[PDB]
Design a protein around this nucleic acid. Structure first.
Lengths: 166, 406, 98, 92, 67, 116, 164
RNA sequence: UUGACCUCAAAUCAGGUAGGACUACGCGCUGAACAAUAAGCGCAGGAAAAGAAAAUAACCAUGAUUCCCUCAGUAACGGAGUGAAGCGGGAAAAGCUCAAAUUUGAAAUCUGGCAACAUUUCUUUUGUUGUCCGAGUUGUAAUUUCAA
RNA sequence: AUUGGAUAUGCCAUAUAAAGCGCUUUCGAAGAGUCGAGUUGUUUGCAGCUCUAAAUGGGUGGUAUCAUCUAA
């Protein structure tokens, strides 16, 4: 497989090859719009491991957000508003420079029949998943609101429970 | 008795002198220090008493290991494992073998399942008894050591005392077999005419194939270091219209004896067998004896040899010629021309790659040959590092060396 | 009869059991292919500007300088010690060839 | 022992008017090579063996099975009269 | 409930699969050449055993042929 | 903010009806699955025996039930728990075996194609 | 900017003559088209339906995961890499992996030609593992030409930082 | 000149979808005075959220989540005040899907058009079969998810 | 008049198939601008900023080596 090489190469985030490509691609991405469709993911290993499949109904959108709330969470909500017919599946960092942080969001069309007939992505079609990025139900949204397991991570206490026989 | 039926199935009715004087005392749970020569029939002497013991105590896989057998080398351990399969053909007691150079990750899962009769070597056995979690051995009640003089000759000094400190000693029955009585054997017991050919590695099989074609009308026997090599070599030769008998058989002792008997009776034919299997068998009047691989025990080999003897030696193993000088044995060098050598290497590689079982056997034979080579006592003479793995695979019918974990 | 007596006591007689290793605990074990892939990628991708600084420091002795630089960029000393050993091996492999 | 010395590159440094008692610049570093030549310290030698030690499955020495599944499915459709045969297509 | 369960299990108890036209011919060609008791040699054949069935599957083809 | 309990009798009845609604759907089989017997994890309670979550894979293997069919006959599986002592193994293997001694498993219909 | 040697190696591609000879052998080993495969399968279906042994197919190998797997297993005899893969990281390791395994390799011009061979719109990489006995000499000649025109040539610029 | 591919486009092209309202109960981003409150903003459903351990513990060990009782007005923080959690007892119980290993003896995968055949809470809804095109090898199926 | 899950009984069933449990002289991939370190706020969490990893590694506990877990 060639995704073991891509996953290992992505760890050398500022090697000679990665720094040159990040500098080149940052210049190009700044030429295009703030939110623009990506013909294919720039990180086919990272998109693949986050649920993306190269089939119809799967949409990749790139976005840049100014540096200086979470940046990844801001990318997800702005892209989800941009194409409001799609469901935001996941997102990942692709590039950054002194001014901008670039992210790609994986969106899924819940009306396409290739999505509605796939039991592995059928869950996103249900209306309880409308705008998951707006309720913090994506990976970065869950991390942002301290959702997790362990000791690392109020209304029921402020109440006075008064039983019948007390 | 299931043991008796298996013995009958194995093809054995009479007992040997070593078995006569050891089986009765063993059945009474008596520790014995034995001194029997190689190939004297010891295999039934120390295996069937502990099998009855295992049946008598009604051992189950949950109880773990109850019998432990230590063997000097892999090939001897594999033969003992093969014999134990024949003896336990009608029993519900589990058995297994762990050896150096094998899949340790697989053996840990095997040991966790629960193996009663275990055949091992000092190096691998100590590893599993220390680091393998879930390996149950607190119920060990019979330990056997074979070829103790050979074991200490290999270099297992610091391991034999180390392993005994871990294994339980109370209630445990102990056995120790040693052909030669050195000073180390009692120390451990108290605590418990030639012909050689300088042939390149990649041309080894082609020279052998050409030689066997030339001597088709004679009686030739070939000794090769591994039984897995024997199975592949016989299977490959039978696939190129060269009918050759083999002593590997189907790991059935009765078939091996039948094949040897047929070879001796026949005036012509070629038989392939290992040095260990041939050790202890009366060699008939054979026109040619061929040592395709270097012997595991050169000291035993020089005494065993003493019509025509041939030895295939790699150029990197020419130091063994100096060893033969120190042993005071006459010898001569045989030369061969490259034009008479059959150039069927390309055809051989194609045939192996096309067939599944031929390729599977070749990979097993290659792995077993390398593991046997890596465990040779004469490290200075037969160095695995000095060997070229590309040439070795070429003689086995490979374009590139298969990936084997040393 | 099927039914659980949910009270106290079952017997103080105890005997330990030997458990195998779960496959999750095998995490962190290095694969032969993974180590090969990492070595290929490490060569194909260059070195970070800070890695080049550490490598040029190691070559001209200055081991304390390299350790201090690696700790400053990476963080803990354990990460810094691993990087020095890795970059030292890179230098030795290169020096054997070029 | 370490002698409790003091390196010349430590972050800490020594030295109204503060004269009562006693006890920036753009300096470069050196002419450094920013574009070093490619250094093949791992692929200068050829690995002679395959990377994977996994055994070869029998599926690569036998006729394809998923093709056989399709063949049986196509044969069923021909029996059920769902797919026109090559002869039927030719004659039509 | 118990009587109904056993009477249904007895009725739906035919667990022996008869060989088909292809299975019958496949095992017949192997038996008529490599004997009857040797299955390992039957599986190791490459020409007659094109599907590369192992010894267990060939044994099951024999057993189902008998019944 | 005061939490009243005026619906306490109503919740008692609503849960009873859920038990009866469940029993209406699954007529002859128990409304609960069989739970193992475990020991609470502290020196204060380790002498008590309480009900566990599910049976360990080593418990199921000893009793003769594979982990793929255990759930089908109402035997929960706990992949997390393990048998550190031979007593816990014997206490819950017998619980499974007694469960299987009292179990009537109704047969299912199987599709048998006409050809081979 | 200055192009790293791993990316700069993709600017030097196989020349006109040797690439033409490469695709001439490749076009003899094109995979079966979806239409041609359907005709062959229904032909066997008609034989099965009426009344009823073949040889292993020979074709070029494509797909990135498949080809990288073949290289790692040393099963490939020639690997041809598209010179214009849009995210270059998909093939930036391929020349070095082909060097580690000792697989002959070349960087051919554009991915449309590679995709046309395999009846697709685009192929990032192609690999040849097996040829018929009559094409052994043709493949051997191309391997020598690829070595002499791509490996023997260059081999010094691929270590140099290109561009700028 | 033509073709393949890529890119940028355009179209009252065909087929879809988003907005707004209600928000008692969800979940988010916020945020004063005096409370992690009001208000503001965003997003849902019949429940929401959470969820099959990068969880506890130090025992003879437990075993996704949620809720109730208890722990306990305790430990801890800081004297006041703030104020949990593990265990224990109950309600309910259900587990799983991928990424990462070559189907390589055969992209085995999928949307759409067209044409038939059915089917309907329903002439209103759902599919099936055949054919062509497209998607897809920069990876769609089968297989695997560490409990292995 | 609509529909639930079953039962019984026909007709088809693309099984050259697909599974569970035995065994191993063969293998066993595990998620990175993330963990983490430093510094500022909000409230250990979260976020910004500078830097930036590992493979029996990493997280969290009891040791003050052992236990437990397997994140992005």
């Amino acid at each position: 497989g060639a995704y073991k090489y891509l996953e290992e190469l992505a760890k050398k985030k500022q090697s000679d090859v990665n720094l040159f490509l990040s500098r080149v691609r940052a210049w190009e991405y700044r030429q295009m719009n703030v939110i623009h469709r990506a013909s294919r993911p720039s990180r086919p290993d990272k998109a693949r491991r986050l649920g993306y499949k190269a089939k119809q109904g799967y949409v990749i959108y790139r976005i840049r957000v100014r540096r200086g709330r979470s940046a990844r969470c801001t990318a997800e909500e702005r892209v989800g508003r941009y194409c409001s017919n799609l469901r935001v599946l996941n997102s990942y960092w692709v590039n950054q420079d002194a001014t901008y942080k670039f992210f790609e969001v994986i969106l899924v069309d819940p009306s396409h029949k290739a999505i509605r007939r796939d039991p592995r992505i059928n869950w996103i079609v249900n209306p309880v998943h409308k705008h998951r990025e707006s309720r913090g139900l994506t990976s970065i949204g869950k991390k942002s609101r301290g959702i997790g397991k362990g000791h690392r991570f109020w209304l029921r206490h402020n109440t006075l429970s008064l039983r019948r026989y007390r | 008795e299931n043991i008796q039926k298996a013995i009958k199935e194995m093809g054995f009715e009479t007992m040997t002198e070593i078995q006569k004087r050891s089986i009765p005392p063993l059945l009474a749970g008596r520790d014995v220090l034995g001194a029997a020569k190689t190939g004297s029939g010891k295999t039934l002497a120390f295996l069937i008493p502990t099998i009855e013991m295992l049946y008598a105590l009604k051992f189950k896989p949950r109880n773990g290991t109850g019998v432990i057998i230590i063997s000097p080398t892999r090939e001897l351990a594999l033969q003992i494992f093969g014999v134990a399969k024949e003896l336990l053909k009608y029993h519900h007691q589990t058995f297994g073998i762990v050896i150096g150079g094998a899949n340790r990750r697989a053996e840990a899962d095997k040991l966790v399942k629960g193996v009663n009769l275990l055949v091992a070597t000092p190096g691998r056995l100590l590893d599993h008894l220390q680091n393998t979690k879930g390996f149950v051995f607190r119920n060990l009640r019979s330990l056997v050591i074979d070829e103790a003089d050979r074991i200490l000759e290999i270099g297992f000094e610091d391991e034999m005392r180390q392993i005994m400190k871990i294994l339980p000693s109370e209630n445990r029955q102990t056995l120790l077999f040693s052909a030669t009585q050195t000073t180390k054997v009692e120390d451990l017991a108290r605590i418990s005419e030639q012909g050689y050919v300088v042939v390149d590695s990649d041309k080894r099989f082609l020279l052998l194939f050409s030689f066997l074609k030339r001597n088709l009308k004679k009686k030739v026997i070939v000794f090769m270091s591994s039984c897995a090599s024997v199975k592949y070599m016989a299977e490959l030769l039978n696939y190129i219209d060269l009918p050759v008998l083999d002593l590997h058989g189907k790991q059935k002792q009765q078939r091996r004896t039948n094949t040897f008997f047929e070879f001796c009776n026949a005036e012509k034919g070629i038989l392939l067998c290992t040095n260990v299997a041939a050790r202890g068998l009366d060699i008939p009047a054979v026109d040619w004896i061929v040592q395709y691989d270097p012997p595991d025990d050169p000291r035993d080999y020089i005494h065993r040899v003493g019509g025509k003897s041939l030895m295939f030696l790699a150029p990197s193993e020419l130091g063994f010629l100096r060893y033969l000088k120190t042993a005071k044995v006459s010898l001569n060098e045989f030369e061969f021309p490259a034009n008479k050598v059959a150039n069927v290497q390309s055809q051989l590689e194609k045939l192996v790659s096309k067939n599944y079982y031929l390729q599977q056997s070749a990979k097993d034979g290659y792995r077993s040959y390398l593991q046997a080579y890596a465990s040779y006592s004469l490290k200075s003479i037969f160095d695995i590092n000095k060997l070229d793995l590309a040439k070795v695979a070429k003689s086995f019918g490979f374009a590139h060396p298969p990936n084997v974990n040393i | 009869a099927p039914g659980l007596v949910v009270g106290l006591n079952k017997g103080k007689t105890l005997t330990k059991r030997q458990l195998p290793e779960r496959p999750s605990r095998r995490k962190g074990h290095l694969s032969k292919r993974t180590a090969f892939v990492r070595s290929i990628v490490r060569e194909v991708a260059g070195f970070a500007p800070y890695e080049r600084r550490v490598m040029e420091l190691i070559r001209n002795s200055q081991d304390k300088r390299a350790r201090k630089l690696a700790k400053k960029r990476l963080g803990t000393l354990k990460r810094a010690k691993g990087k020095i050993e890795e970059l030292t091996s890179v230098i030795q492999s290169s020096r054997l060839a070029h | 022992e370490i002698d409790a010395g003091y390196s010349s590159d430590s972050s800490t440094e020594d030295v109204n008017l503060y004269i009562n008692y006693d006890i920036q610049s753009e300096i470069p570093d050196e002419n450094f090579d920013p574009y070093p030549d490619y250094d093949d310290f791992f692929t200068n030698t050829v690995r002679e063996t395959p990377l994977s030690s996994a055994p070869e499955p029998k599926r690569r020495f036998a006729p394809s099975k998923h093709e056989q599944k399709r063949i049986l499915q196509l044969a069923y459709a021909i029996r059920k009269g769902r797919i026109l045969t090559s002869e039927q297509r030719a004659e039509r | 409930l118990e009587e109904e369960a056993v009477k249904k299990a007895a009725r739906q108890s035919n667990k022996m699969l008869p060989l088909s036209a292809f299975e019958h011919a496949y095992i017949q060609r192997l038996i008529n050449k490599y004997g009857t008791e040797d299955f390992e040699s039957m599986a190791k054949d490459v020409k007659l055993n094109s599907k590369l069935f192992n010894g267990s599957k060939l044994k099951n083809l024999y057993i189902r042929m008998k019944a | 903010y005061v939490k009243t309990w005026f619906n306490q009798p109503g919740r008692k009845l609503r849960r009873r009806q859920a038990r009866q609604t469940k029993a209406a759907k699954i007529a002859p089989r128990p409304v609960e699955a069989i739970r193992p017997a475990v020991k609470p994890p502290t020196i204060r309670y380790n002498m008590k025996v309480r009900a566990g979550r599910g049976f360990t894979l080593e418990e199921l293997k000893a009793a003769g039930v594979s982990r793929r069919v255990a759930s089908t006959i109402g035997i929960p599986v706990d992949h997390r728990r393990r048998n550190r002592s031979e007593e816990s193994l014997q206490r819950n293997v017998e619980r499974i075996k007694v469960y299987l001694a009292h179990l009537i498993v109704f047969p299912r219909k199987a599709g048998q194609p006409k050809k081979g | 900017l200055k192009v790293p040697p791993a990316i700069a190696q993709f600017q030097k591609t196989l020349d006109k003559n040797t690439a033409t000879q490469v695709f001439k052998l490749l076009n003899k080993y094109r995979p079966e088209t979806a239409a041609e495969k359907k005709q062959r399968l229904v032909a066997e279906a008609e034989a099965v339906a009426n009344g009823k042994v073949s040889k292993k197919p020979y074709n070029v190998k494509y797909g990135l995961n498949h080809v990288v797997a073949l290289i790692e297993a040393k099963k490939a005899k020639l690997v041809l890499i598209a010179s214009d893969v849009d995210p270059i990281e998909l093939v930036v390791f391929l020349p070095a992996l082909c060097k580690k395994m000792g697989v002959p390799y070349a960087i051919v011009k554009n991915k449309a030609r590679l995709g046309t061979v395999i009846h697709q719109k685009t192929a990032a990489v192609l690999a040849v593992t097996e040829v018929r006995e009559e094409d052994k000499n043709e493949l051997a000649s191309i391997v020598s030409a690829v070595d002499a025109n791509f490996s023997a040539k260059y081999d010094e610029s691929r270590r140099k930082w290109g561009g700028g």
